[PDB]
PDB file of C-alpha atoms and ligand atoms in Angstrom:
ATOM      1  CA  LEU A   1     102.415  83.577 116.677  1.00 47.02           C
ATOM      2  CA  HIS A   2     101.813  84.803 119.813  1.00 45.38           C
ATOM      3  CA  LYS A   3     101.206  88.110 121.234  1.00 46.58           C
ATOM      4  CA  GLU A   4     103.004  89.263 124.114  1.00 48.75           C
ATOM      5  CA  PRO A   5     102.524  92.277 126.333  1.00 48.59           C
ATOM      6  CA  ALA A   6     104.905  95.290 126.173  1.00 49.09           C
ATOM      7  CA  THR A   7     104.060  99.088 127.081  1.00 47.71           C
ATOM      8  CA  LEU A   8     104.628 102.152 125.491  1.00 49.29           C
ATOM      9  CA  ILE A   9     107.869 104.213 126.508  1.00 51.66           C
ATOM     10  CA  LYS A  10     107.812 106.491 123.516  1.00 49.15           C
ATOM     11  CA  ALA A  11     106.780 107.178 120.124  1.00 50.57           C
ATOM     12  CA  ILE A  12     109.360 107.614 117.621  1.00 46.77           C
ATOM     13  CA  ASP A  13     108.149 107.748 114.250  1.00 49.00           C
ATOM     14  CA  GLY A  14     105.796 105.855 111.306  1.00 51.24           C
ATOM     15  CA  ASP A  15     107.304 102.712 111.790  1.00 51.31           C
ATOM     16  CA  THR A  16     109.478 102.706 115.334  1.00 45.93           C
ATOM     17  CA  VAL A  17     108.464 102.871 118.671  1.00 47.49           C
ATOM     18  CA  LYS A  18     110.221 102.419 122.052  1.00 45.37           C
ATOM     19  CA  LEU A  19     108.689  99.946 123.915  1.00 44.89           C
ATOM     20  CA  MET A  20     109.324  97.870 127.362  1.00 43.13           C
ATOM     21  CA  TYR A  21     109.342  94.366 126.630  1.00 43.67           C
ATOM     22  CA  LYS A  22     110.285  91.928 129.119  1.00 42.23           C
ATOM     23  CA  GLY A  23     111.085  94.926 131.487  1.00 41.39           C
ATOM     24  CA  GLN A  24     113.672  95.918 129.201  1.00 41.45           C
ATOM     25  CA  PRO A  25     113.449  99.495 127.125  1.00 39.90           C
ATOM     26  CA  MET A  26     113.545  98.259 123.125  1.00 39.54           C
ATOM     27  CA  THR A  27     113.246  99.963 120.118  1.00 39.52           C
ATOM     28  CA  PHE A  28     110.925  98.217 117.997  1.00 40.12           C
ATOM     29  CA  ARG A  29     110.573  98.457 114.193  1.00 41.53           C
ATOM     30  CA  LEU A  30     107.690  97.372 112.685  1.00 41.35           C
ATOM     31  CA  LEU A  31     107.775  94.420 110.202  1.00 41.54           C
ATOM     32  CA  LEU A  32     106.808  94.431 106.386  1.00 41.49           C
ATOM     33  CA  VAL A  33     106.356  98.308 106.290  1.00 43.38           C
ATOM     34  CA  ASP A  34     107.967 101.165 105.421  1.00 41.41           C
ATOM     35  CA  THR A  35     106.770 104.543 106.455  1.00 37.49           C
ATOM     36  CA  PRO A  36     108.380 107.732 105.142  1.00 37.56           C
ATOM     37  CA  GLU A  37     110.845 109.296 106.930  1.00 36.68           C
ATOM     38  CA  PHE A  38     109.785 112.169 109.173  1.00 41.34           C
ATOM     39  CA  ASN A  39     111.584 114.707 107.010  1.00 43.94           C
ATOM     40  CA  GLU A  40     109.505 113.465 103.739  1.00 42.06           C
ATOM     41  CA  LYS A  41     105.841 113.958 102.558  1.00 43.72           C
ATOM     42  CA  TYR A  42     103.648 111.939 104.749  1.00 42.42           C
ATOM     43  CA  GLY A  43     106.460 111.501 107.048  1.00 43.53           C
ATOM     44  CA  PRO A  44     104.793 113.739 109.869  1.00 43.88           C
ATOM     45  CA  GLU A  45     101.130 112.057 109.135  1.00 46.84           C
ATOM     46  CA  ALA A  46     102.556 108.445 109.667  1.00 48.01           C
ATOM     47  CA  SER A  47     104.368 109.778 112.606  1.00 51.74           C
ATOM     48  CA  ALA A  48     101.361 111.055 114.310  1.00 47.92           C
ATOM     49  CA  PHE A  49      99.032 107.870 113.358  1.00 49.15           C
ATOM     50  CA  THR A  50     101.459 105.795 115.027  1.00 53.04           C
ATOM     51  CA  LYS A  51     102.086 107.860 117.784  1.00 53.13           C
ATOM     52  CA  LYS A  52      98.444 108.310 118.430  1.00 55.48           C
ATOM     53  CA  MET A  53      97.414 104.599 118.282  1.00 56.87           C
ATOM     54  CA  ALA A  54      99.874 103.788 120.687  1.00 57.60           C
ATOM     55  CA  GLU A  55      99.201 106.441 123.078  1.00 57.49           C
ATOM     56  CA  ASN A  56      95.284 105.937 123.030  1.00 60.74           C
ATOM     57  CA  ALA A  57      96.026 101.969 123.300  1.00 60.23           C
ATOM     58  CA  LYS A  58      94.929 100.533 126.869  1.00 61.89           C
ATOM     59  CA  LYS A  59      97.112  97.505 125.845  1.00 65.50           C
ATOM     60  CA  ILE A  60     100.038  97.012 123.361  1.00 67.59           C
ATOM     61  CA  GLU A  61     101.352  93.716 122.341  1.00 66.19           C
ATOM     62  CA  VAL A  62     104.084  92.674 120.101  1.00 62.65           C
ATOM     63  CA  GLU A  63     104.150  89.330 118.086  1.00 65.46           C
ATOM     64  CA  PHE A  64     107.561  87.916 116.571  1.00 62.10           C
ATOM     65  CA  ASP A  65     107.354  86.193 113.449  1.00 61.11           C
ATOM     66  CA  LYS A  66     109.102  83.078 112.589  1.00 59.49           C
ATOM     67  CA  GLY A  67     112.593  84.319 111.999  1.00 59.30           C
ATOM     68  CA  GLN A  68     114.954  87.129 113.146  1.00 60.58           C
ATOM     69  CA  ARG A  69     113.947  88.804 116.038  1.00 57.95           C
ATOM     70  CA  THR A  70     116.523  91.676 115.905  1.00 62.76           C
ATOM     71  CA  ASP A  71     118.067  93.390 113.261  1.00 62.47           C
ATOM     72  CA  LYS A  72     121.389  94.660 112.735  1.00 59.98           C
ATOM     73  CA  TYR A  73     120.934  97.855 114.742  1.00 62.51           C
ATOM     74  CA  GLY A  74     119.607  95.826 117.657  1.00 63.70           C
ATOM     75  CA  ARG A  75     115.898  96.972 117.130  1.00 65.15           C
ATOM     76  CA  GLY A  76     113.138  94.248 117.665  1.00 65.90           C
ATOM     77  CA  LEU A  77     111.178  93.152 114.578  1.00 67.09           C
ATOM     78  CA  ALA A  78     107.426  92.466 115.138  1.00 64.95           C
ATOM     79  CA  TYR A  79     103.828  92.944 114.745  1.00 65.64           C
ATOM     80  CA  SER A  80     102.297  95.453 117.181  1.00 66.09           C
ATOM     81  CA  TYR A  81      99.069  95.449 118.174  1.00 69.40           C
ATOM     82  CA  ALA A  82      97.135  98.261 120.040  1.00 68.46           C
ATOM     83  CA  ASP A  83      93.919  97.268 121.533  1.00 73.71           C
ATOM     84  CA  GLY A  84      94.007  93.858 119.223  1.00 77.74           C
ATOM     85  CA  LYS A  85      94.163  96.049 116.088  1.00 79.46           C
ATOM     86  CA  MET A  86      97.892  95.663 114.203  1.00 78.81           C
ATOM     87  CA  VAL A  87      99.446  98.809 113.704  1.00 82.03           C
ATOM     88  CA  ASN A  88     101.661  97.446 110.983  1.00 81.28           C
ATOM     89  CA  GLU A  89      98.207  96.804 108.776  1.00 83.10           C
ATOM     90  CA  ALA A  90      96.704 100.132 109.872  1.00 83.83           C
ATOM     91  CA  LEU A  91      99.569 101.960 108.473  1.00 80.91           C
ATOM     92  CA  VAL A  92      99.094 100.086 105.237  1.00 78.88           C
ATOM     93  CA  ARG A  93      95.092 100.481 105.205  1.00 79.50           C
ATOM     94  CA  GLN A  94      95.808 104.188 105.507  1.00 79.54           C
ATOM     95  CA  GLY A  95      98.470 104.687 103.050  1.00 76.42           C
ATOM     96  CA  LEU A  96     100.879 105.904 104.906  1.00 76.96           C
ATOM     97  CA  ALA A  97     103.173 103.201 104.925  1.00 77.25           C
ATOM     98  CA  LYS A  98     104.085 100.424 101.998  1.00 78.57           C
ATOM     99  CA  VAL A  99     104.419  97.056 102.059  1.00 78.99           C
ATOM    100  CA  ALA A 100     108.366  96.386 102.211  1.00 77.59           C
ATOM    101  CA  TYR A 101     110.936  94.545 103.597  1.00 77.42           C
ATOM    102  CA  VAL A 102     109.400  91.270 103.033  1.00 72.88           C
ATOM    103  CA  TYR A 103     112.381  88.693 103.907  1.00 71.21           C
ATOM    104  CA  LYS A 104     111.645  84.909 103.476  1.00 71.89           C
ATOM    105  CA  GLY A 105     110.667  83.545 106.805  1.00 70.75           C
ATOM    106  CA  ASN A 106     109.746  87.060 108.618  1.00 70.53           C
ATOM    107  CA  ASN A 107     106.542  87.091 106.320  1.00 68.28           C
ATOM    108  CA  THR A 108     103.587  85.633 108.145  1.00 68.58           C
ATOM    109  CA  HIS A 109     101.264  88.775 107.443  1.00 71.86           C
ATOM    110  CA  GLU A 110     102.692  89.486 104.035  1.00 71.30           C
ATOM    111  CA  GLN A 111      99.487  88.775 102.298  1.00 69.12           C
ATOM    112  CA  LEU A 112      97.221  90.344 104.941  1.00 65.66           C
ATOM    113  CA  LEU A 113      99.186  93.783 104.510  1.00 66.52           C
ATOM    114  CA  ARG A 114      99.239  93.548 100.667  1.00 65.86           C
ATOM    115  CA  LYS A 115      95.457  92.868 100.687  1.00 62.56           C
ATOM    116  CA  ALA A 116      95.220  96.164 102.808  1.00 64.06           C
ATOM    117  CA  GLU A 117      97.793  98.117 100.393  1.00 62.64           C
ATOM    118  CA  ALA A 118      95.558  97.113  97.224  1.00 62.49           C
ATOM    119  CA  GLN A 119      92.754  98.794  99.280  1.00 60.46           C
ATOM    120  CA  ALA A 120      94.393 101.834 100.158  1.00 60.57           C
ATOM    121  CA  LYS A 121      95.656 101.964  96.610  1.00 60.03           C
ATOM    122  CA  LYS A 122      91.997 101.649  94.955  1.00 64.77           C
ATOM    123  CA  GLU A 123      90.924 104.592  97.399  1.00 65.40           C
ATOM    124  CA  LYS A 124      93.983 106.786  96.324  1.00 67.97           C
ATOM    125  CA  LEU A 125      94.734 107.196  99.970  1.00 68.79           C
ATOM    126  CA  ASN A 126      97.806 109.238 101.246  1.00 69.49           C
ATOM    127  CA  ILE A 127     100.898 108.048  99.711  1.00 74.23           C
ATOM    128  CA  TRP A 128      98.719 106.926  96.871  1.00 72.86           C
ATOM    129  CA  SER A 129      97.103 109.930  96.055  1.00 70.85           C
TER     130      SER A 129
HETATM  131  C1  LIG B 201     111.905  96.130 108.536  1.00 71.75           C
HETATM  132  C2  LIG B 201     113.253  95.687 108.372  1.00 71.75           C
HETATM  133  C3  LIG B 201     114.117  96.412 108.293  1.00 71.75           C
HETATM  134  N1  LIG B 201     115.459  95.806 108.606  1.00 71.75           N
HETATM  135  C4  LIG B 201     116.985  96.830 107.946  1.00 71.75           C
HETATM  136  C5  LIG B 201     116.772  97.150 106.511  1.00 71.75           C
HETATM  137  C6  LIG B 201     117.439  98.317 106.233  1.00 71.75           C
HETATM  138  O1  LIG B 201     118.918  98.404 106.420  1.00 71.75           O
HETATM  139  P1  LIG B 201     119.554  99.683 105.891  1.00 71.75           P
HETATM  140  O2  LIG B 201     119.483 100.578 106.965  1.00 71.75           O
HETATM  141  O3  LIG B 201     120.894  98.924 105.575  1.00 71.75           O
HETATM  142  O4  LIG B 201     118.955 100.166 104.444  1.00 71.75           O
HETATM  143  C7  LIG B 201     116.942  99.100 107.673  1.00 71.75           C
HETATM  144  C8  LIG B 201     115.556 100.115 106.835  1.00 71.75           C
HETATM  145  O5  LIG B 201     115.133 100.285 108.127  1.00 71.75           O
HETATM  146  P2  LIG B 201     114.131 101.861 108.314  1.00 71.75           P
HETATM  147  O6  LIG B 201     113.226 101.768 107.173  1.00 71.75           O
HETATM  148  O7  LIG B 201     113.919 102.072 109.512  1.00 71.75           O
HETATM  149  O8  LIG B 201     115.665 102.911 107.960  1.00 71.75           O
HETATM  150  O9  LIG B 201     116.184  98.075 108.263  1.00 71.75           O
HETATM  151  C9  LIG B 201     115.898  94.556 108.230  1.00 71.75           C
HETATM  152  O10 LIG B 201     117.051  93.955 108.605  1.00 71.75           O
HETATM  153  N2  LIG B 201     114.811  93.817 108.716  1.00 71.75           N
HETATM  154  C10 LIG B 201     113.671  94.203 108.708  1.00 71.75           C
HETATM  155  O11 LIG B 201     112.588  93.370 108.702  1.00 71.75           O
HETATM  156 CA1  LIG B 202     111.403 104.245 107.049  1.00 71.26          CA
END
């Protein structure tokens, strides 16, 4: 997989962000995770976590997997990095997302994320509390 440039347009919620990619605005949905919706428990904390990580970053990058790059709603499907740190992994590591939506052929980082989830669950963090 390859990291490609993007710039932040706007935080949306814990697992979706609006980025400019190849010079076009697009909403990205983060691969392999599910955050609570804003109206659900930990939703506001997940949204805040992603917003801070994206807004504080000097450099945002997106990394597509091997499979589908767009979902049925036209959202890009990627892993996103803020100053080299994977946002997807970070959310899971903090217990603010579950590993989810693991589809064959877009699952390169599944084991990395499941290891983070196991650590969050051992620490009883947030959704695992
Ligand atoms: C993360 C991800 C979500 N989706 C679709 C499945 C879900 O469809 P439904 O909307 O029919 O439930 C939806 C969940 O996204 P959200 O968790 O953003 O709501 O996005 C994909 O198709 N591929 C993916 O990799
Ligand atoms: Ca969600």
